[PDB]
Amino acid sequence: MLSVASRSGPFAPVLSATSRGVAGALRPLVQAALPATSESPVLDAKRSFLCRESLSG
Amino acid sequence: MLSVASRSGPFAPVLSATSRGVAGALRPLVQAALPATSESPVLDAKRSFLCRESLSG
Amino acid sequence: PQDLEFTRLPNGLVIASLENYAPASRIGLFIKAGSRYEDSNNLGTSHLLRLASSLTTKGASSFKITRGIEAVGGKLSVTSTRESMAYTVECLRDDIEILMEFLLNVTAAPEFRRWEVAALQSQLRIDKAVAFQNPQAQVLENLHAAAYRNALANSLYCPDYRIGKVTPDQLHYYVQNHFTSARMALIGLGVSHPVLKQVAERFLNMRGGLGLSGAKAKYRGGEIRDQNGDSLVHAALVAESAATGSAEANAFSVLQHVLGAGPHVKRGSNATSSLYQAVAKGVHQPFDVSAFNASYSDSGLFGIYTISQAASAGDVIKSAYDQVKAIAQGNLSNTDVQAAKNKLKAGYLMSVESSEGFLDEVGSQALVAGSYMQPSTVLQQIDSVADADVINAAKKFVSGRKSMAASGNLGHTPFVDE
Amino acid sequence: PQDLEFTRLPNGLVIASLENYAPASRIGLFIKAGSRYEDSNNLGTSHLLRLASSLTTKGASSFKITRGIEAVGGKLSVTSTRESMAYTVECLRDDIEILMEFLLNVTAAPEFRRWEVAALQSQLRIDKAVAFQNPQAQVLENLHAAAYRNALANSLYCPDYRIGKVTPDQLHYYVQNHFTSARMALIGLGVSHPVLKQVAERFLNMRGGLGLSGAKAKYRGGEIRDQNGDSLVHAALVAESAATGSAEANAFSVLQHVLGAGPHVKRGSNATSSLYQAVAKGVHQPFDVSAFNASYSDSGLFGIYTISQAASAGDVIKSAYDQVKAIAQGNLSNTDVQAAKNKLKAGYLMSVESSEGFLDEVGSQALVAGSYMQPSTVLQQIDSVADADVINAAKKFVSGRKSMAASGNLGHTPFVDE
């Protein structure tokens, strides 16, 4: 039967021995950026550098 | 009417100027050292060991 | 063509190889492991296993794994959840047979050496602090702790007292009891079938059985509060609903899209969200509300999820709870069910377009059910959901024992009995 | 002789002096202030006020307070609880008039300067980590958070997110609204009466009224669990009982000593403890059990408290709960009530021997009731408690909604519904 990425919810974590570690099966709560002054939280590790755009194209 | 320290087990903490800060009214659950091995807490911020028993005059 | 081949081996291993004619390939290995299967003594062993993929194994050192994979431009990556783990490799077509022998060394014969595990313990603190810069990550770990007594309350990240203490003997024990043959699925996307079969007969030599059975999850109706200095209040309010692979599970999926479960138009006002329009009548301040829905093998959680300012967190949760009450007492139009069946069918087909979304879905179906069903079968089951099942799912929510988790400045958040 | 003099001033200030002829003196100032009176925005302001006694005031600098008091061998000290604060000075008899003008500068005209408060913020982290090397300190802060929704759930120590953020404007506001005339008591032990009167007319100039009161405490029956790496499990299980200054409050005090509330013989077997003997029938491993009893102005908590090994924490709490059930259904001997009235009367008289235990008791009675009663009055009220009141106090515990807090390896601790 289905997974948990369908029926968003359960969060999921991803690790890369070559790219940036991630979490997100469901954590973006989209439309939550609409609220003004949602200042972007500066990542300390500064990961997801433009979603690892470096060498992607 | 009576106090916290008479018939009750809440806390009091104490801060001094020349002696060592403490905090307890119930705290010591005694009769737990005749059943063996309850070890004194190891400190990284040293505190009173005798709580000024020195300088007795 | 050749839509999927599908074999179940004698030791319960499921192989599924599809032959596209794309220049790139992708190989997955999907295992039944995860936080669910750890008890109170070895908490955090699954977070350390996730970080230890490019350490020394019995067939390739930690230099040759990093250098041999970067030489051809490949990737190696691990994704896990509360109920499964997934190892995934990828390169171009002619390079696929060397990145496939590395993958069977990372997961089937690892060596946990002392000085490498000890140097790895500082990575647990880095990975947990990266994940927890999002407020949605810890509110959802708290919510599983407030909803269960065991076996689904364990977090995906290691607890703070336990960092520095996960031992090499505990990692050897988690793989020896949970990475077995009858809990695994090998899925390939640019490979032929008889070569993926000849790869899989190189870990038959042991771990051919079932593994440590998982305790059943007991529902606790709890409440965990977390005062801190964040600007907004994140709050979740759920109840127990339905396991995956049941007739009632599809109706909670349809009820999720009736209420409103995400966006469709960039900077849109969510006009077909009954949850969002009910809240926004009286609330004029920045907020966000959604329907939460999680589904696991023996239980699931359905409820709401709000993000709001701290002085308005009571008005937002109360408005988003009266609207679910309006559905359970019969106020349910017929075109609202039909517009919600489209979003559930369309989103299932857009989720399977990529090579990672397709390989995700085939891996979940091989672990949960042991078969593959075409997306025409799945699209029929969504259209068989009646209006008498959307109402009998909002009745199970309204009369069920609740659970809660919150974060922020909690001076105006209601308590779960209030 | 002259057992106590007792005056209530026109602005509700209570002065009480006893003239002994001892060479040393002691002066106290007792205020209705404490963690109870802070809301959700200024948590931890009372822990910082406790640490700021030897900072610069309007009449003596921080050099002259430290040097002027150490010159004559004096002491200055602050003790607070959830419901009160107490400032106490002491020296020899001829030195008492200079340590009394310092005390009225620390508490009645302080100046909270920026760079001194900012340098003081690191002391909050030192004091909290010193107190929390005892496991009893955080289990009891958790237990008040699991038992109340407000106003008695606030901890005595500042929360971790809030260290570094307590401002000078918040300290100015706590003292301006809670350190008022009609909430204070000035008690002297080696001083005459008309000189303590002429000291107290040096803060009449303002703060002559009632001050910001505390919201009534609402009972929440909750449960807070705390997994960590300590060796033993500390667990507490209470219910709501009775405020102080009532007829039912003395019966919970008598029931506390029937069950067993501490030791009398060094290295003893607690032979007159009905709680301790009931647990120790089946449990042969190291443990400790007691009766907890706390009492405040509008509520109180009565229950049990165990310390045990982690695999035995269920057997210990279950045995220590059947014994309270045996009392509420009538099994109560007559000599057990009489042996318990002795420990409650004897312990009250040994608590008033010292000069600090005496001055403690006179300060609590001036804030709670506004009068002083001799220890012959108190000893009669204990002997008027009947056997029909010890039973009707164990009935209120057994049928009341519970609360819990635990710490340690919690894999075998029961849940509050189990």
PDB file of C-alpha atoms in Angstrom, chain A residues 1-4 7-18 23 26-32 34-36 41-45 47 52, chain C residues 50-51 75-80 131 133-134 136-137 156-157 245 249-250 253 263 268 270 286-288 292-296 361 364 368-369:
ATOM      1  CA  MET A   1       0.000   0.000   0.000  1.00  0.00           C
ATOM      2  CA  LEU A   2       0.986   3.543  -0.011  1.00  0.00           C
ATOM      3  CA  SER A   3       3.941   5.222   1.578  1.00  0.00           C
ATOM      4  CA  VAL A   4       3.974   8.121   3.941  1.00  0.00           C
ATOM      5  CA  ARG A   7      -0.699  11.502   3.098  1.00  0.00           C
ATOM      6  CA  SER A   8       2.146  14.077   3.592  1.00  0.00           C
ATOM      7  CA  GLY A   9       2.695  14.291   7.481  1.00  0.00           C
ATOM      8  CA  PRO A  10       5.323  11.982   8.790  1.00  0.00           C
ATOM      9  CA  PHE A  11       8.566  13.954   8.481  1.00  0.00           C
ATOM     10  CA  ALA A  12      11.468  12.207   6.924  1.00  0.00           C
ATOM     11  CA  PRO A  13      15.216  12.676   7.218  1.00  0.00           C
ATOM     12  CA  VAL A  14      17.794  12.317   4.421  1.00  0.00           C
ATOM     13  CA  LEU A  15      21.610  11.983   4.713  1.00  0.00           C
ATOM     14  CA  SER A  16      24.234  12.414   1.885  1.00  0.00           C
ATOM     15  CA  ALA A  17      27.845  11.161   1.865  1.00  0.00           C
ATOM     16  CA  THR A  18      28.203  13.663  -1.057  1.00  0.00           C
ATOM     17  CA  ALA A  23      14.502  16.629   6.586  1.00  0.00           C
ATOM     18  CA  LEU A  26       6.171  16.973   5.362  1.00  0.00           C
ATOM     19  CA  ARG A  27       7.559  20.072   7.195  1.00  0.00           C
ATOM     20  CA  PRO A  28       7.216  23.074   4.734  1.00  0.00           C
ATOM     21  CA  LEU A  29       3.666  24.004   5.895  1.00  0.00           C
ATOM     22  CA  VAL A  30       3.452  26.034   2.611  1.00  0.00           C
ATOM     23  CA  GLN A  31       1.371  29.291   2.663  1.00  0.00           C
ATOM     24  CA  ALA A  32       3.162  29.889   6.023  1.00  0.00           C
ATOM     25  CA  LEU A  34       2.653  34.367   3.155  1.00  0.00           C
ATOM     26  CA  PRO A  35       2.699  35.691   6.807  1.00  0.00           C
ATOM     27  CA  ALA A  36       4.859  38.849   6.443  1.00  0.00           C
ATOM     28  CA  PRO A  41      16.385  31.546   9.233  1.00  0.00           C
ATOM     29  CA  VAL A  42      20.114  31.722   8.256  1.00  0.00           C
ATOM     30  CA  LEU A  43      21.359  28.082   8.272  1.00  0.00           C
ATOM     31  CA  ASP A  44      24.512  27.857  10.462  1.00  0.00           C
ATOM     32  CA  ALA A  45      25.855  24.932   8.361  1.00  0.00           C
ATOM     33  CA  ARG A  47      23.446  23.672   3.769  1.00  0.00           C
ATOM     34  CA  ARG A  52      23.315  22.112  -4.020  1.00  0.00           C
TER      35      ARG A  52
ATOM     36  CA  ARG C  50      22.128   6.750   9.015  1.00  0.00           C
ATOM     37  CA  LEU C  51      25.406   8.713   9.264  1.00  0.00           C
ATOM     38  CA  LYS C  75      25.976   9.549  -5.569  1.00  0.00           C
ATOM     39  CA  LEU C  76      25.216   7.574  -2.403  1.00  0.00           C
ATOM     40  CA  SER C  77      22.412   8.570  -0.037  1.00  0.00           C
ATOM     41  CA  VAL C  78      20.258   7.266   2.841  1.00  0.00           C
ATOM     42  CA  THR C  79      16.638   8.209   3.614  1.00  0.00           C
ATOM     43  CA  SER C  80      14.771   6.789   6.596  1.00  0.00           C
ATOM     44  CA  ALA C 131      17.275  19.824  11.394  1.00  0.00           C
ATOM     45  CA  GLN C 133      16.347  25.203  12.808  1.00  0.00           C
ATOM     46  CA  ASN C 134      12.890  24.466  11.437  1.00  0.00           C
ATOM     47  CA  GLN C 136       8.144  21.915  12.406  1.00  0.00           C
ATOM     48  CA  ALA C 137      10.833  19.304  13.186  1.00  0.00           C
ATOM     49  CA  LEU C 156      14.305  10.256  14.456  1.00  0.00           C
ATOM     50  CA  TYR C 157      17.218  12.142  16.058  1.00  0.00           C
ATOM     51  CA  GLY C 245      -4.126  -0.587   3.653  1.00  0.00           C
ATOM     52  CA  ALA C 249      -7.759   4.850   5.320  1.00  0.00           C
ATOM     53  CA  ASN C 250      -8.818   6.132   1.890  1.00  0.00           C
ATOM     54  CA  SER C 253      -7.256  10.773   2.672  1.00  0.00           C
ATOM     55  CA  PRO C 263      -1.283  24.996  -1.972  1.00  0.00           C
ATOM     56  CA  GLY C 268      -2.996  32.017  -3.587  1.00  0.00           C
ATOM     57  CA  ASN C 270      -6.653  28.678  -0.873  1.00  0.00           C
ATOM     58  CA  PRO C 286      -0.800  36.221   9.730  1.00  0.00           C
ATOM     59  CA  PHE C 287      -1.492  32.530  10.211  1.00  0.00           C
ATOM     60  CA  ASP C 288      -1.377  29.184   8.446  1.00  0.00           C
ATOM     61  CA  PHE C 292      -2.290  16.672   9.077  1.00  0.00           C
ATOM     62  CA  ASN C 293      -2.529  12.996   8.190  1.00  0.00           C
ATOM     63  CA  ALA C 294       0.009  10.294   8.998  1.00  0.00           C
ATOM     64  CA  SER C 295      -0.360   6.590   8.341  1.00  0.00           C
ATOM     65  CA  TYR C 296       1.633   3.614   9.565  1.00  0.00           C
ATOM     66  CA  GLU C 361       6.473   4.290  -4.427  1.00  0.00           C
ATOM     67  CA  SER C 364       6.847   1.277  -0.111  1.00  0.00           C
ATOM     68  CA  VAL C 368       3.790  -2.960   3.098  1.00  0.00           C
ATOM     69  CA  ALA C 369       1.827  -5.314   0.832  1.00  0.00           C
TER      70      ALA C 369
END
